[PDB]
């Protein structure tokens, strides 16, 4: 039976995807920490996200062990950008990223379903950050970002500062 | 005497008008809940209004029973819009709506007066939301709405967020 | 066009949530009618007035959760007329319970067809939402 | 021949109570099957095991009250086979809730046809018994 | 409308029927108080019944007043027997009597129903003593009554003495 | 190995036998609840028995699950009688029934023994009701049952009423 082989390879792919995502948020957080960007709450938002995604990876690592599989780590690739350009662009990038992480998470779930396997730690993690990142994107665009730096300043103070 | 017949038909029309209004505010509230609109306090404002107007309907239903009339329900028609376009337009629409609900409420009152009938639950509900909706409309227009999305963002944070 | 947050949300699922919203609003209307019938002095059954007013507010609260879900998933809410509740009398407290039976009967059945649809389309998010929403409607406290 | 206590108890009412007794026994059987399914180590849903065992004992207790009524009115109990519950698996906890839905659906509908029958035959004793028995099944605590 | 006239005549017939029944149980009770019958618990059973049936009459008298009708009393006829012959025969007679009282009680109920009138004090009093009197009859016959005086002695001690 | 297949079929047969027995006692209990039989303690005796036999079935259902077998239910057949004729005959029928249930229970035990399998929930349930039902049968016959209805009346009061 190919299943426990597929099942642990999928979990292993997902572990690397979550560590990758944690790495992207870390990169974004400290971009807003730069003196020429200097948006403190944009930096806190992404840093907190960075820690949540590392927690997702550890949860899947605990899960791989509980199912008797073998954790197989890979390189954590660098993000696609060093310069994230703007708070709008970073939120757009976080939205794209979460969608892709979620898509590979549906496939993990469609593997344990579609092979009759309850015990799907997935049922807690799915789809909640996506709408929030989309709302952030929407509000920044309506305010005039990224051309308007006043928009991102005030979004940092009013939405992400609460 | 035609009166108790007119009196309960009027109360019955008003019940449906209040349920209709509650339905409009519900529609507006969840329009601002959309990810491509994403104004949380606009959505809370209209939702709270939606519940107040349902309370008005129930008060008139209790009143119809206390006067020995018969409650006669009708279809609650859908609002005129699915897309309310902007926070300004929705406030303008709420203002138009409250004026029309109030006008049919004066006629209910000019029926119990003008036919010598105290016991007018109306004397508590009349004219208070209208000036507030007008002030909201005025402030949004002065700020630059609806072309300026910065205006509605800040109005949401500063006026409706208090 | 398409919502920027939409992902794995079938157009049939979106349309079925929109149908379920109107059903729950309708259920709220029907329970409200019953509640103010038992409030009549003809009838004066306060226990049944009290209980159908509570069910009216619960059904309307369930509709709003379905509306919240539609937006969270990037679907678009399309509201329709809430049809009048069909009978203004309800006669006895047991003839009302019978009407409430066929109504809760069709609302819960609609939720189970929603669950089958979410399953056929491999939408675990939708399925899990419908499941708990259904167990909630059915197993209070 | 005829019971010395029988009075105003139509032969159709007697036969319908005998049908309802078997239905409630059957409902008790079906709930018991479900309960020990969720007790399997495959499944291990103790909340659903606990709840369907309680419904099994309630349905069997309701059958005995119908049997008590049949004797109080001078009818004669005639028992039939309790048919096996149809499916031994039940798959998921929600596919069981769906089966429980159609079952409670048909049991309650049978009680309402019993009430209509008691009304057509001017049996206020029977009608009032079915009414409270029905509100009890439906409004616990 | 003939109804309030029929409704109070029915209540008036029922009042006299309950007083009649109370009179029959009184007669039976003190028959078992005779030295040549001498069954103390048969006498307590019927006496208690005698008081319950007087309470039924008073309940219907209170009801007639609450409905704005007029109480119209009649002669309370003597029972059909002075000598009730045996404990079996008296129980058989009580069974026949309760059935007849119940039958005129269904007609009272089929008058307020069948003329759409809730407020039927009847819904508390109907059919409960009948099965008990039938069980008593059954047990006495199976024991050997009325030829066997041992049967009625022991029934008095064991069933009616508890 | 045929064993776990035989072992769960036997448990499955026994489950249906206990539910069957519970059904027989239920039928007997409410026969003595009839107004023309009217023996209250005969009805309590069999009803209590009816509940004990349902508990036996559930114990074997719990056991089937603990052993990793599959519960396979069948029709619960109706008892052989609607009219149980007399308290003597019902006790005789209960005695015959318990003997047959016990015989299929020895075979269940001679299957786990005779195939070296401790873990025999049987060791708690075997042979205790049989002697009691036989004593009841003996006493009723000596008293004059079933021709004598005095006998069953007094047995109900003195033996089953304690
Ligand atoms: Fe993640
Ligand atoms: Fe209003
Ligand atoms: Fe009476
Ligand atoms: Fe047993």
CSV table of N, CA, C and O and ligand atoms in Angstrom, one decimal, chain F residues 14 17-18 21 52-54 56-57 98 101 105 125, ligand 4:
chain,number,residue,atom,x,y,z
F,14,UNK,N,-26.3,-14.5,20.8
F,14,UNK,CA,-26.7,-14.4,22.2
F,14,UNK,C,-27.3,-13.0,22.4
F,14,UNK,O,-28.3,-12.9,23.2
F,17,UNK,N,-30.9,-13.3,21.4
F,17,UNK,CA,-31.6,-14.1,22.4
F,17,UNK,C,-32.0,-13.3,23.6
F,17,UNK,O,-33.0,-13.5,24.2
F,18,UNK,N,-31.1,-12.4,24.1
F,18,UNK,CA,-31.4,-11.6,25.3
F,18,UNK,C,-32.4,-10.6,25.0
F,18,UNK,O,-33.3,-10.4,25.8
F,21,UNK,N,-35.6,-12.3,24.9
F,21,UNK,CA,-36.2,-12.6,26.2
F,21,UNK,C,-36.7,-11.3,26.9
F,21,UNK,O,-37.8,-11.4,27.5
F,52,UNK,N,-33.8,-6.5,33.1
F,52,UNK,CA,-32.5,-7.2,33.3
F,52,UNK,C,-32.0,-7.8,32.1
F,52,UNK,O,-30.8,-7.8,31.8
F,53,UNK,N,-32.9,-8.3,31.2
F,53,UNK,CA,-32.5,-9.0,30.0
F,53,UNK,C,-32.0,-8.1,29.0
F,53,UNK,O,-31.1,-8.4,28.2
F,54,UNK,N,-32.6,-6.9,28.9
F,54,UNK,CA,-32.0,-5.8,28.1
F,54,UNK,C,-30.6,-5.4,28.5
F,54,UNK,O,-29.8,-5.1,27.7
F,56,UNK,N,-28.5,-7.5,29.9
F,56,UNK,CA,-27.6,-8.6,29.4
F,56,UNK,C,-27.2,-8.4,28.0
F,56,UNK,O,-26.1,-8.6,27.6
F,57,UNK,N,-28.2,-7.9,27.2
F,57,UNK,CA,-27.9,-7.7,25.8
F,57,UNK,C,-26.9,-6.6,25.6
F,57,UNK,O,-25.9,-6.8,24.8
F,98,UNK,N,-35.7,-19.2,30.2
F,98,UNK,CA,-34.4,-19.0,30.8
F,98,UNK,C,-33.5,-20.2,30.6
F,98,UNK,O,-32.3,-20.1,30.4
F,101,UNK,N,-32.2,-19.9,27.1
F,101,UNK,CA,-31.2,-18.9,27.0
F,101,UNK,C,-29.9,-19.3,27.7
F,101,UNK,O,-28.8,-19.0,27.2
F,105,UNK,N,-26.0,-20.2,26.2
F,105,UNK,CA,-25.0,-19.5,26.9
F,105,UNK,C,-23.9,-20.4,27.3
F,105,UNK,O,-22.7,-20.0,27.4
F,125,UNK,N,-23.2,-14.2,34.6
F,125,UNK,CA,-24.6,-14.6,34.3
F,125,UNK,C,-24.7,-16.1,34.0
F,125,UNK,O,-24.2,-16.5,32.9
G,4,LIG,FE1,-30.4,-13.1,30.1
